[PDB]
Amino acid sequence: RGDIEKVTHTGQVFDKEDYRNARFVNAKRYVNENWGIKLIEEVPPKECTERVVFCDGGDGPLGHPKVYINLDKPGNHICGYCGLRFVKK
Amino acid sequence: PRPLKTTNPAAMKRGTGGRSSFNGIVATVFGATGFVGRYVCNKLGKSGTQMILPYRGDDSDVIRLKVTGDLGQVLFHFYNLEDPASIRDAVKHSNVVINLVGRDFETKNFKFKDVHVNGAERIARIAREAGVERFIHLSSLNVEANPKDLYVKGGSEWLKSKYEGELRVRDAFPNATIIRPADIYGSEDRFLRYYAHIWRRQFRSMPLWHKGEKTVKQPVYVSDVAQAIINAAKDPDSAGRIYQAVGPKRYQLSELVDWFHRLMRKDQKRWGYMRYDMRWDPTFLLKAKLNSFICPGTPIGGLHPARIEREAVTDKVLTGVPTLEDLGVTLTTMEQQVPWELRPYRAALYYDAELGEFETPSPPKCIEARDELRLFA
Amino acid sequence: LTNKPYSFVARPWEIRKVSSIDVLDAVGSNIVVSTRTNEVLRILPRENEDVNEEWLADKSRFACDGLKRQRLVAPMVRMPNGELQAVEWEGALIAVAKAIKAAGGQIAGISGQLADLEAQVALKDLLNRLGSEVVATEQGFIAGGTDNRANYLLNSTIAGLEEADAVLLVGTNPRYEAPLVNTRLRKAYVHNELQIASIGPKIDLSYDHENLGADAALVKDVCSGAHAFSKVLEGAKKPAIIIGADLLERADGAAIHATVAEYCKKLKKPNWNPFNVLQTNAAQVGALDVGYKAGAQTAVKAQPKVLFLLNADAGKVTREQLPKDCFVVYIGSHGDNGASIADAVLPGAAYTEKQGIYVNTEGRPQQTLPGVSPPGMAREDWKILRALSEVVGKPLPYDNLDELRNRLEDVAPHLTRLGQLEPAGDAGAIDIKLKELRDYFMTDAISRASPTMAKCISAVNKQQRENEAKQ
Amino acid sequence: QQTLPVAEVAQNLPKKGYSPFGTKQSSVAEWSLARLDDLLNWGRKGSIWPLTFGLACCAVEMMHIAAPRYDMDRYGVVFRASPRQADVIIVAGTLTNKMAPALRKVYDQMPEPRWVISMGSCANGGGYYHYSYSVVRGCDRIIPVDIYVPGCPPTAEALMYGVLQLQKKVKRMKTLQMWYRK
Amino acid sequence: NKLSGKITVPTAVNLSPISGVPEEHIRERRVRIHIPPKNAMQSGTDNVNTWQIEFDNRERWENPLMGWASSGDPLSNMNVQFGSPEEAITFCERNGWRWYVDGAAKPKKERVKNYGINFAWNKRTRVSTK
Amino acid sequence: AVQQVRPILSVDREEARKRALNLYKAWYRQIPYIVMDYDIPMTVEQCRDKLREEFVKHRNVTDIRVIDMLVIKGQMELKESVEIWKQKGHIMRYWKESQDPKPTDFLSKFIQGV
Ligand SMILES: NC(=O)C1=CN([C@@H]2O[C@H](COP(=O)(O)OP(=O)(O)OC[C@H]3O[C@@H](n4cnc5c(N)ncnc54)[C@H](OP(=O)(O)O)[C@@H]3O)[C@@H](O)[C@H]2O)C=CC1
Ligand code: SF4
Ligand SMILES: [Zn+2]
Numbered sequence A: 001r002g003d004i005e006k007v008t009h010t011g012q013v014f015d016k017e018d019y020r021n022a023r024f025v026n027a028k029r030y031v032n033e034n035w036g037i038k039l040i041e042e043v044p045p046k047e048c049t050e051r052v053v054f055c056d057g058g059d060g061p062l063g064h065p066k067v068y069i070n071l072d073k074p075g076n077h078i079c080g081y082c083g084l085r086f087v088k089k
Numbered sequence B: 001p002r003p004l005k006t007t008n009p010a011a012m013k014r015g016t017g018g019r020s021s022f023n024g025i026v027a028t029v030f031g032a033t034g035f036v037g038r039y040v041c042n043k044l045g046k047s048g049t050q051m052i053l054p055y056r057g058d059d060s061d062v063i064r065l066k067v068t069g070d071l072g073q074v075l076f077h078f079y080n081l082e083d084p085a086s087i088r089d090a091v092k093h094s095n096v097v098i099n100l101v102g103r104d105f106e107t108k109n110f111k112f113k114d115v116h117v118n119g120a121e122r123i124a125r126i127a128r129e130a131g132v133e134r135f136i137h138l139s140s141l142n143v144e145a146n147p148k149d150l151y152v153k154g155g156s157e158w159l160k161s162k163y164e165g166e167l168r169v170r171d172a173f174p175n176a177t178i179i180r181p182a183d184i185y186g187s188e189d190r191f192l193r194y195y196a197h198i199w200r201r202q203f204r205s206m207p208l209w210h211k212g213e214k215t216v217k218q219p220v221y222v223s224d225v226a227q228a229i230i231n232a233a234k235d236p237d238s239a240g241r242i243y244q245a246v247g248p249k250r251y252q253l254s255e256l257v258d259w260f261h262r263l264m265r266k267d268q269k270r271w272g273y274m275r276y277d278m279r280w281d282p283t284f285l286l287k288a289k290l291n292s293f294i295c296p297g298t299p300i301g302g303l304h305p306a307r308i309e310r311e312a313v314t315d316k317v318l319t320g321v322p323t324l325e326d327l328g329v330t331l332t333t334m335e336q337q338v339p340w341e342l343r344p345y346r347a348a349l350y351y352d353a354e355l356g357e358f359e360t361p362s363p364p365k366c367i368e369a370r371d372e373l374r375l376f377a
Numbered sequence C: 001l002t003n004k005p006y007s008f009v010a011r012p013w014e015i016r017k018v019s020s021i022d023v024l025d026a027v028g029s030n031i032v033v034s035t036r037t038n039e040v041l042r043i044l045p046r047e048n049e050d051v052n053e054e055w056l057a058d059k060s061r062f063a064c065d066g067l068k069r070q071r072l073v074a075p076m077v078r079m080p081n082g083e084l085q086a087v088e089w090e091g092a093l094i095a096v097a098k099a100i101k102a103a104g105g106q107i108a109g110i111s112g113q114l115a116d117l118e119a120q121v122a123l124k125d126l127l128n129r130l131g132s133e134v135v136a137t138e139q140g141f142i143a144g145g146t147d148n149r150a151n152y153l154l155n156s157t158i159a160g161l162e163e164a165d166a167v168l169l170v171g172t173n174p175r176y177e178a179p180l181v182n183t184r185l186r187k188a189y190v191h192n193e194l195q196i197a198s199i200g201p202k203i204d205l206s207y208d209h210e211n212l213g214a215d216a217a218l219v220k221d222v223c224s225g226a227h228a229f230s231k232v233l234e235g236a237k238k239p240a241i242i243i244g245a246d247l248l249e250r251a252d253g254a255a256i257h258a259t260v261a262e263y264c265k266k267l268k269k270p271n272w273n274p275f276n277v278l279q280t281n282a283a284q285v286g287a288l289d290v291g292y293k294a295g296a297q298t299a300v301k302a303q304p305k306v307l308f309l310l311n312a313d314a315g316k317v318t319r320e321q322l323p324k325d326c327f328v329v330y331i332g333s334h335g336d337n338g339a340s341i342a343d344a345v346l347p348g349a350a351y352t353e354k355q356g357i358y359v360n361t362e363g364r365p366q367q368t369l370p371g372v373s374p375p376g377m378a379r380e381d382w383k384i385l386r387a388l389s390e391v392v393g394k395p396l397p398y399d400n401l402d403e404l405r406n407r408l409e410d411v412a413p414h415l416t417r418l419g420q421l422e423p424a425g426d427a428g429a430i431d432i433k434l435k436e437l438r439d440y441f442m443t444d445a446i447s448r449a450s451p452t453m454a455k456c457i458s459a460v461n462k463q464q465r466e467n468e469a470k471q
Numbered sequence D: 001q002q003t004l005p006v007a008e009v010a011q012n013l014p015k016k017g018y019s020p021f022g023t024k025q026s027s028v029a030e031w032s033l034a035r036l037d038d039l040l041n042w043g044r045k046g047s048i049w050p051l052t053f054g055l056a057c058c059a060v061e062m063m064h065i066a067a068p069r070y071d072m073d074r075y076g077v078v079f080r081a082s083p084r085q086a087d088v089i090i091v092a093g094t095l096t097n098k099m100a101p102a103l104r105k106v107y108d109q110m111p112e113p114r115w116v117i118s119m120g121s122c123a124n125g126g127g128y129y130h131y132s133y134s135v136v137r138g139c140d141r142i143i144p145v146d147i148y149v150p151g152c153p154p155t156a157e158a159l160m161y162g163v164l165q166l167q168k169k170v171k172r173m174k175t176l177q178m179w180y181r182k
Numbered sequence E: 001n002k003l004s005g006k007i008t009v010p011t012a013v014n015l016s017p018i019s020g021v022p023e024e025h026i027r028e029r030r031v032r033i034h035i036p037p038k039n040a041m042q043s044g045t046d047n048v049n050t051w052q053i054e055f056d057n058r059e060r061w062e063n064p065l066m067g068w069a070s071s072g073d074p075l076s077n078m079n080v081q082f083g084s085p086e087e088a089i090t091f092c093e094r095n096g097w098r099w100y101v102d103g104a105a106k107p108k109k110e111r112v113k114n115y116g117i118n119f120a121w122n123k124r125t126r127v128s129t130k
Numbered sequence F: 001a002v003q004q005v006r007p008i009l010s011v012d013r014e015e016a017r018k019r020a021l022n023l024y025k026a027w028y029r030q031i032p033y034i035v036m037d038y039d040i041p042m043t044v045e046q047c048r049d050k051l052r053e054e055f056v057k058h059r060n061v062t063d064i065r066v067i068d069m070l071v072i073k074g075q076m077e078l079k080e081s082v083e084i085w086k087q088k089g090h091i092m093r094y095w096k097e098s099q100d101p102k103p104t105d106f107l108s109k110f111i112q113g114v
Helices: A019-024 A036-042 B037-047 B063-068 B084-091 B112-130 B157-172 B190-196 B222-234 B253-263 B283-294 B305-312 B334-345 B369-376 C058-068 C089-103 C117-130 C179-191 C217-224 C228-235 C245-250 C254-267 C284-290 C296-301 C381-392 C401-411 C437-441 C445-449 C451-469 D007-012 D028-046 D058-064 D100-109 D120-125 D156-172 E023-028 E085-094 F013-037 F044-056 F064-082 F088-092 F106-112
Strands: A052-055 A067-070 A085-087 B026-030 B096-099 B134-138 B177-180 B205-208 B274-277 C016-021 C030-035 C040-045 C107-111 C135-137 C166-170 C195-198 C239-244 C275-278 C306-310 C327-330 C357-359 C365-367 D088-092 D115-119 D147-149 E007-010 E051-054 E079-082 F002-005
Touching: B026 B037, B037 B063, B037 B222, B084 B112, B096 B112, B096 B222, B112 B134, B112 B157, B134 B157, B134 B222, B157 B177, B157 B305, B177 B222, B190 B253, B190 B305, B190 B334, B205 B253, B253 B334, B283 B305, C040 C058, C058 C445, C058 C451, C089 C306, C089 C327, C089 C381, C089 F106, C107 C117, C107 C296, C117 C135, C117 C284, C117 C306, C117 C357, C117 C381, C117 C401, C135 C296, C166 C228, C195 C228, C217 C228, C217 C254, C239 C245, C239 C254, C245 C254, C245 C275, C254 C275, C284 C357, C381 F106, C437 C451, C445 C451, D028 D156, D058 D088, D058 D115, D058 D120, D058 D156, D088 D100, D088 D120, D100 F088, D115 D120, D115 D156, D120 D147, D147 D156, E007 F064, E051 E085, E079 E085, F013 F044, F013 F064
Parallel strands: B026 B096, B096 B134, B134 B177, B205 B274, C107 C135, C107 C306, C166 C195, C166 C239, C239 C275, C306 C327, D088 D115, D115 D147
Antiparallel strands: A052 A067, C016 C030, C030 C040, C357 C365, E007 F002, E051 E079
């Protein structure tokens, strides 16, 4: 069965000869289908003008605490909390 | 230098001993819902061992075994002896397998052959293909290549099947450990329930072959058998070695039954125990035959004739064949165990007579080698 | 600013603190191993200003990851195929006891550098039962001068180093041989006008130092007192002369030591012994106080049929260099290259996992504490030897740590007065390793085992390449 | 993990049958034994009699279920006091060491087929007192638990939902049908 | 000839049997009287003014099921505080344990810590920057 | 190193033995009743034997006060067994039959882990 084959995004598969496989002979090995790494990758990097932007990730008090991210560096800048991505250029 | 099988530290022995310390043993226990399965599994759980407990009855029959281990230590796997696919699945990840399968009587879905030898070899072949390090089997101590009945003609099939099971299991598995007990006495046991149950008794006159005075029995206690199983499972150097599992002191069936009835308070004034000759009375056999023919499940009190032949058969040990002492297992004697064991069945506290002050049941007396040679002349 | 490796891993409230001592350098700095659920997450300095100074080098700080990779987790025995398959403790020790008994009483034991004194003493006692006194240490030392305690220590009281006034480092780079000692000197250089000369090759001590050359003839002329810095040494009130143990094992250096001790006679000021020896391994001083020989080649020259190796993963011994028939047993934790050349490989619990006694450079003995359960079948080193003895049939008397700690008390009461330092009084070209950080990071098996150190080596090499190419 | 079918899939599918065994039996004996199991399970399912052990805090919910808001005798459930006449035991509250032998004794004095519901966290895994010197960590270590009702306490709805889940387990139990194979 | 039945008895009364601790722990475990270590990246020091005792680590494996940190060793978390080591040794004896003190530290030697040295005409201690 | 302190019960070591042996009387005399009352495997001789060893459990008690308390515990446990407050599990507790005597010699310890 594929359930006990899938690689958890955390990065675990029971070895092919590992007795802890036995626990799934009769129950499914739940593995989630949304991997945050892929999803945030898909989200495009927002861009702004000001040297310093602010993110709360979510909205109002439904997101993470307000954080200010400077963009003067050439590259992207990833929000510490939500993983949103910023680029000033 | 004994090699190792796995190099994954998660799959490797650890802990301080107990319900949590994983012992590096993963076992399937075929026939776990039995007289000896309970004792084996409880011992294995005490070690902190992973169990797979295959079962063919309703899981409710086995749910009690869940109490024997910490979380995830016990899994129940529905199978059937007639489904090799299921057995393969049950043994793939296993490290050891124990074959506690086998009835005392015959069924409608199984004749002694198909359940007692043909099934066993299938299990062993599947186990061997699965690459299972250790395999264990049980075979009665009285096993003979050419059984001869003693009182009733068609009553030695169990013995024939037992020999067949041993040889073919050894054929299909290079080095399995075939432990060999006989007449294991314990709680919820064929042995003591049989000698206690009513149908076994006539009016007040237990019928015994040759008055039970031409029989030598050496029963052993169930836990000591179980404790042997685990100790020989932990050790792989026991592999490929039969073991005659017997108790400390042989006995004469007359000594036992009299002591039993003394323990049960069955002999004070009125209950009036007597011992017949089973040959004299021709009624006991009919009871067995009818009781077999009528009961759909296990016959009442295990009265089927095969049990009757078993009591008749003597217990022939042999030297060289290793023993429990070789397995490092101390053996609680009957004198320590049986009194408490039969305490539930004590009865007969008449108003007409005296009680309480009756002495503690004076124990029985063993039978020595020359004294045996007197018995058999 | 925060640890890149110990990043996001655990919170201080969750974690558990275990006092301990660093072992990767002979400073023996005090450590607080920050364990959480059988995982050594990080390392912190424990304030012991007599020794530790509350700082801590990068090696001790970051190499903790080395204790999670290349670990030995199963006894192994070399088959006719030769692959060293995994086996169990029964067969392993029984096989080892077989070889020892039938080898023919020609045995040696070479102690590595991460072996605690208990492992040394257990090793020695067993081999004295077997009748073999060939018990060497990897890092060789003075011939015929190993007897007076002050010949292999920092008699100058590492705390007292900061009090030093004129320091002479003969080819002994502290900045990569004892960084904690180095910063103590810099504190002197900043607060007491420490006159720091050098009689070795080029190095940088993070501060000015007078380089008088490299040739070993310079130490002799100075010891006679024929050079300007020698006059400075004379005029000082706390002179110190530091000689690196490598040089003392280089070659014909016992003469160098003898002259150095000769001059220290006059330099001695009351309550102050100038002579200084920056030990490198954390077990060398342990070896001296138990009475080993020095020099792995010494043990090879004995021509033993069997060999013992307390986690001795230095290349100083190679089976080619060994007798061909020499049976080889390795009793160490990390499966490093030196472990790779043994026919029997017994796992061992690393220093954080085992309770042992380490004599630091200056000489105080200090006790590690176990913070993490060892992996696999790994056991304590002094337990492996004890089991093997009783398997052979020459049992040692010490079945418990205290029994063993009393056996050490017999050998050296000074050596069990933990936390104290008994005084020893009187004491008795040049090219050196670890003259650059690139040399420094890769020193020991744990160091090579660690992933972060490997990243550090690459990062420094790349910045150098930038200097070449960014140009 | 699986998920319910969608509207059109339901449209294709037929009635889900009543006896969970189904109606695919081959021979007369099979078909007959299927019905007798169905009748037995129907009896044991419709009428179930808790023992009302109810040690603590959880017990209050064990009473609210008897209360008239989420009526339980509506389902055929009655609180018989005597364990000889009680068919099910809702162990609820903490199991202290003084109680452990008592629970064991009460359990096996009850005749089978006996099912145990471990209500509340205190019984499930020792709950909030798990690291205590006097509490049985869980009740799995004394008796064979059948259904776990998480909660502290479980809201009454949760408890009697679990009861229905026990009814489903009582519905699908195979005793005669599979004795035939035995 | 009495003061409400007062008696003369030795001050050091071992209480191992009355205590209730199993002899296994008493006979295989030590105690490590010390002062709790000062956290490296802190600066307040009002949690290392007490003398503390605890018991050596025994073992920790991981639960096969869920990969927790199982531990079948009771006195693993045990931790008690005292005002002075001699008090703790007195306590530890009365409960019949094996112990070995761990000397905390000598009194801090005064450091001059002058401000002017940052700016000196001759001494090396002139600060490079501010 | 002496302290002038209160008593509990016994003022001299001999009174302590007098109290201690009184307890031994109650326990010896009780054993048969518990064999009857408590349906447990144990027999009179074994119960008597354990009672002997369990006093030997602490032979080298010295302080008058400590031995007094040990007796105080015993008088309690006596009453809890005299009357049947205890349970068959509780009374058997003195044997510790659930766990096998763990290995003791160094190899068995070594080969079976810490
Ligand atoms: N006094 C004795 O019984 C003796 C014991 N032995 C041997 O030891 C073993 C254990 O003895 P004991 O427990 O008393 O015997 P039991 O009659 O109690 O058998 C116990 C187990 O055997 C299982 N069993 C029987 N037939 C089958 C089958 N076709 N398929 C699957 N399981 C089956 C049963 O499964 P389920 O209950 O679920 O139907 C049961 O769980 C036996 O095999 C016996 O040969 C040897 C000497 C004497
Ligand atoms: S689980 Fe919650 S509701 Fe139930 S007894 Fe415990 S604390 Fe009370
Ligand atoms: Zn954000």
